[PDB]
């Protein structure tokens, strides 16, 4: 049974408490009595190196078999790579993709150096929800669709959310509360 949520943000130097919807989602989830949504500024925030983010997820964010991991952009990539070798209660991917997009800073992360272990992810995480938008200025839909197909995600496909940089995200709250089994 899930005990907490963790937000792994996108790359970049924005404070996790105010960038996009992270702080709003944390505050909304923590309205549930006793429920923690961990969201911390990441080490190596610009390059988002796998060798730094994945240990941080294990040691400092305590991501385990009772954790719902909410990963956005680089954090979605990290959550997928994390789940190749870690049991995770559930993963909500926001703006997920599969390759370095030809960008050197994506490449520098190290997430895109070897094949995706899709079957291992699915065995380690039976509950994978995905948000994506066809007007994402950074991601081609093909890459978001590849994630949805390879991981058999519950796909919430939008047309007008871009890279999900807005400040509120009620659809995500509903998803997370469903995963927590909060009754209506």
Coordinates of C-alpha atoms in Angstrom, one line a residue:
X1 CA 0.0 0.0 0.0
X2 CA 1.3 3.5 -0.9
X3 CA 2.8 5.5 2.0
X4 CA 3.9 8.7 0.2
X5 CA 4.4 10.5 -3.1
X6 CA 7.7 11.9 -4.4
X7 CA 8.0 14.5 -7.2
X8 CA 11.1 14.3 -9.4
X9 CA 11.1 17.5 -11.4
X10 CA 12.4 18.4 -14.8
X11 CA 15.9 19.6 -15.2
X12 CA 16.9 23.2 -14.7
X13 CA 17.5 25.6 -11.8
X14 CA 14.0 26.4 -10.8
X15 CA 13.1 26.0 -7.2
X16 CA 10.9 22.9 -6.8
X17 CA 8.6 24.8 -4.4
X18 CA 7.6 27.4 -7.1
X19 CA 8.4 25.9 -10.5
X20 CA 5.3 25.0 -12.5
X21 CA 2.9 22.8 -10.6
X22 CA 5.2 21.0 -8.2
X23 CA 4.5 23.1 -5.1
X24 CA 0.8 23.2 -5.8
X25 CA 0.5 19.4 -6.2
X26 CA 2.5 18.8 -3.1
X27 CA 0.3 21.2 -1.1
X28 CA -2.9 19.6 -2.5
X29 CA -1.7 16.0 -1.7
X30 CA -0.6 17.0 1.8
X31 CA -4.1 18.1 2.5
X32 CA -4.7 14.4 3.1
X33 CA -4.1 13.9 6.8
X34 CA -0.7 12.4 7.4
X35 CA 0.2 12.2 3.7
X36 CA 3.7 13.3 2.6
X37 CA 4.6 14.4 -0.9
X38 CA 8.4 14.8 -1.0
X39 CA 9.7 17.4 -3.4
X40 CA 13.3 18.5 -3.1
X41 CA 15.7 20.5 -5.3
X42 CA 17.7 18.0 -7.1
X43 CA 21.5 17.8 -7.1
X44 CA 23.1 18.3 -10.5
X45 CA 19.8 20.1 -11.5
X46 CA 20.9 21.2 -15.0
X47 CA 22.5 18.0 -16.4
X48 CA 20.2 15.7 -14.3
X49 CA 22.8 13.0 -14.5
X50 CA 21.5 9.5 -13.9
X51 CA 24.5 8.7 -11.7
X52 CA 23.4 11.5 -9.4
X53 CA 19.6 11.6 -9.6
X54 CA 19.0 7.9 -9.1
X55 CA 21.0 7.6 -5.8
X56 CA 19.3 10.8 -4.6
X57 CA 16.0 9.2 -5.4
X58 CA 16.9 6.1 -3.3
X59 CA 18.7 7.7 -0.4
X60 CA 17.2 11.2 0.0
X61 CA 13.8 10.7 -1.5
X62 CA 13.3 7.2 -0.1
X63 CA 11.7 6.0 -3.3
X64 CA 10.5 2.4 -2.6
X65 CA 7.7 -0.1 -3.1
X66 CA 5.3 2.1 -1.2
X67 CA 6.1 5.3 -3.1
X68 CA 4.1 6.9 -5.9
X69 CA 6.7 8.6 -8.0
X70 CA 5.6 11.6 -10.0
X71 CA 8.2 12.4 -12.6
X72 CA 8.2 15.4 -15.0
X73 CA 10.4 15.5 -18.1
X74 CA 13.9 14.6 -16.9
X75 CA 12.3 13.3 -13.8
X76 CA 10.0 11.1 -15.8
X77 CA 13.1 9.7 -17.5
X78 CA 14.7 9.2 -14.1
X79 CA 11.6 7.5 -12.7
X80 CA 11.6 5.1 -15.7
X81 CA 15.3 4.2 -15.3
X82 CA 14.8 3.9 -11.5
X83 CA 12.0 1.4 -12.0
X84 CA 14.3 -0.9 -14.1
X85 CA 15.9 -2.0 -10.8
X86 CA 13.6 -0.7 -8.0
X87 CA 10.1 -1.9 -7.0
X88 CA 7.9 1.2 -7.0
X89 CA 4.2 1.4 -6.0
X90 CA 3.1 3.5 -8.9
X91 CA 4.6 6.0 -11.3
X92 CA 2.9 9.1 -12.9
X93 CA 4.9 10.2 -15.9
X94 CA 4.5 13.8 -17.1
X95 CA 6.0 14.6 -20.5
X96 CA 8.0 11.3 -20.9
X97 CA 10.2 10.4 -23.9
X98 CA 12.7 7.8 -25.0
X99 CA 15.7 9.4 -26.6
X100 CA 18.1 12.3 -26.1
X101 CA 16.1 14.2 -28.7
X102 CA 19.4 15.0 -30.4
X103 CA 20.2 17.5 -27.6
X104 CA 23.6 17.4 -25.9
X105 CA 22.3 18.3 -22.5
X106 CA 19.8 15.5 -22.7
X107 CA 22.7 13.3 -23.8
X108 CA 24.9 14.4 -21.0
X109 CA 22.3 13.0 -18.5
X110 CA 23.4 9.5 -19.4
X111 CA 19.8 8.3 -19.4
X112 CA 19.9 7.5 -23.1
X113 CA 23.0 5.4 -23.5
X114 CA 21.5 1.9 -23.5
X115 CA 18.2 0.1 -24.3
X116 CA 15.1 0.7 -22.2
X117 CA 14.3 -2.3 -20.1
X118 CA 10.6 -1.9 -20.6
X119 CA 9.6 -5.4 -19.4
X120 CA 11.6 -4.9 -16.1
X121 CA 9.9 -1.5 -15.5
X122 CA 6.5 -3.1 -15.9
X123 CA 7.3 -6.0 -13.6
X124 CA 8.7 -3.5 -11.0
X125 CA 5.7 -1.1 -11.4
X126 CA 2.2 -2.4 -12.3
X127 CA 0.6 1.1 -12.1
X128 CA 2.0 3.5 -14.6
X129 CA 0.0 6.6 -15.6
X130 CA 1.2 9.0 -18.3
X131 CA 0.3 12.6 -19.1
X132 CA 1.3 14.0 -22.4
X133 CA 0.3 16.8 -24.8
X134 CA 0.6 17.0 -28.6
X135 CA 1.6 20.6 -28.4
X136 CA 4.7 20.0 -26.3
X137 CA 7.4 22.3 -27.8
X138 CA 10.2 20.0 -26.6
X139 CA 8.9 16.5 -27.3
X140 CA 7.6 14.9 -30.6
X141 CA 4.4 13.0 -29.9
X142 CA 6.1 9.9 -31.3
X143 CA 8.4 9.7 -28.3
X144 CA 5.5 10.1 -25.9
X145 CA 3.6 7.5 -27.7
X146 CA 6.5 5.1 -27.6
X147 CA 6.5 5.3 -23.8
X148 CA 2.7 4.7 -23.7
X149 CA 3.0 1.7 -26.0
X150 CA 6.2 0.1 -24.4
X151 CA 4.9 0.6 -20.9
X152 CA 1.2 0.1 -21.5
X153 CA 0.5 3.3 -19.6
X154 CA -2.8 4.7 -18.7
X155 CA -2.4 7.6 -21.1
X156 CA -4.0 11.0 -20.5
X157 CA -3.4 12.7 -23.9
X158 CA -4.0 16.4 -24.1
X159 CA -3.7 18.9 -26.9
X160 CA -3.1 22.2 -25.1
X161 CA -0.8 21.6 -22.1
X162 CA 2.5 22.0 -23.8
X163 CA 5.3 20.7 -21.5
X164 CA 3.0 20.9 -18.5
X165 CA 4.5 24.1 -17.1
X166 CA 1.3 25.5 -15.7
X167 CA 1.0 26.3 -12.0
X168 CA -1.9 24.0 -11.2
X169 CA -2.6 20.4 -12.2
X170 CA -5.9 19.1 -10.9
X171 CA -6.0 16.1 -13.3
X172 CA -2.8 14.9 -11.7
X173 CA -4.3 15.2 -8.2
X174 CA -7.3 13.1 -9.2
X175 CA -4.9 10.5 -10.6
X176 CA -2.7 10.4 -7.5
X177 CA -5.8 10.2 -5.2
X178 CA -7.1 7.3 -7.3
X179 CA -3.7 5.5 -6.8
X180 CA -4.0 6.2 -3.1
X181 CA -7.5 4.7 -3.1
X182 CA -9.0 7.8 -1.4
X183 CA -12.8 7.3 -1.7
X184 CA -15.2 9.9 -3.1

